[model samples]
Target: ASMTDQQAEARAFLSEEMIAEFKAAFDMFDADGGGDISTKELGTVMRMLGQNPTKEELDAIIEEVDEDGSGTIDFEEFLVMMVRQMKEDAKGKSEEELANCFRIFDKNADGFIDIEELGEILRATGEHVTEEDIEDLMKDSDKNNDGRIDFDEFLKMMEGVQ
Candidate 1:
């Protein structure tokens, strides 16, 4: 009857619009007039979500979330799955936004942000972070351990800033 802190966090992360989207999608998939979604319904839902999972992948997903082994996803599991999918969708959206930001700093379009480009953006913002500071920041943010920061590195660096 009560929610866990993680569930609360997920609820906060999933906005009203997202909940509505989830509800609509779930209702559409509940084709049997039952309160649970069968595997076939789940397959349709996954396809609607732009995914085409192999049979093994779909089975694995059902197994992963079907805690009761009911071979069907009830409302509770549906809610959980929506939150999980929302988090994943948010991550992808954030990555795309970060890539755009990275491009703004990637003046040469070489798919990497060097110290010089970072300095330019910083100056444009009227911030005076030194080249050494930039390098230090890059050292920490570079996910691939590369000398320069790429979009993936930028996404990793900005993961929790929200």
Candidate 2:
């Protein structure tokens, strides 16, 4: 059987609700009410996602998402960068398809994922993993000891995802 154009178009319209949820959570994570999230704020978010961010890991993530090196991430900047990432994720697919991938991995039902979750998802893709391994890695990625992983934490873990 051959695929129909309508089927392709229908697939194109697909979007994972989880991305908006991630954006909403990120907005809340910018706690100080500023459009940009600070290192401290990011740390808290990581804690919530089950991460703690080492100084090195945290700084690197800030660098990754801070695009302009302005030391802050406006909503537009964040969205643009994330969309770019989604685009890259769509190298063999579409942004919507890639987003669906991210959505499936955010298993905590919290909309966003922590390093541990990322690791688990990756492990399913063939990476080796164990709970102890997850904890060890979290401690390294989680610098604040708050019990969650924020953007910085997530970004840090993204290194291995690619």
Candidate 3:
């Protein structure tokens, strides 16, 4: 994964060159150039990024971005969602916001985030992280006896005391 950019927010810069480049990439994503990307097309894209998505994972991603149930993601929706996620990963997380992510991803609400939580987070970052790796890293991150991490805790885990 790359470092976060200096720009901490996601703004679709409507520059001709940039938009053109993005469109080209988007075209590649829409392999058939049908103007819309089906779930299968999206699955291929995700797999390229190293994700081993179950049907549920694919569905969740689609639900998060697909405004309409057409089973395809438009350029606007795809770009906005992707850019924001890219921004979040690059800038890292503020302590509080990291905490929120930890809380939200810790779906089981078991006071501690497990492999599943980390897997979801890794996927969100577009990395396609595996459950085993995430579980291994969990110990280093789960501070406090409470089990789940707050933002500062997550930062510590990621930055190694930064």
Give the higher-TM-score candidate: 2 or 3: 3
The whole-model lDDT of each prediction reads 0.71, 0.58, 0.61
Query: What value of lDDT does candidate 3 attain over all alpha carbons?
Result: 0.61
What tens-digit string does per-residue lDDT give for candidate 3 at 1-162? 222231222333445575466666668867677766765576665445433556676677688766666778766555554554444444654655766766787788765665566777777887766766676677667766454565566667766857
Model 2 per-residue lDDT tens digits across residues 1-162: 122443343334435564455457678867678767764466555555344445675566677666765666555444443443344445535445545765676787685667668677757867677777877777776657776665556555554553
Best model per TM-score: 1
**What's the TM-score of each model vs. the native?**
0.55, 0.30, 0.38
Runs of candidate 2 with Cα error greater than 4 angstroms are 1-15, 31-35, 51-53, 67-69, 74-162
Clashes of each: 0, 17, 3
Query: For candidate 3, what is the TM-score?
Result: 0.38
Number of the candidate with higher lDDT, 2 or 3: 3
Candidate with the greatest lDDT versus the true structure: 1
Q: Please give the range of 10 consecutive residues that has the lowest summed lDDT in model 2.
A: 1-10
Name the regions of candidate 1 deviating beyond 4 angstroms. Answer: 1-21, 46-57, 65-70, 109-115, 125-162
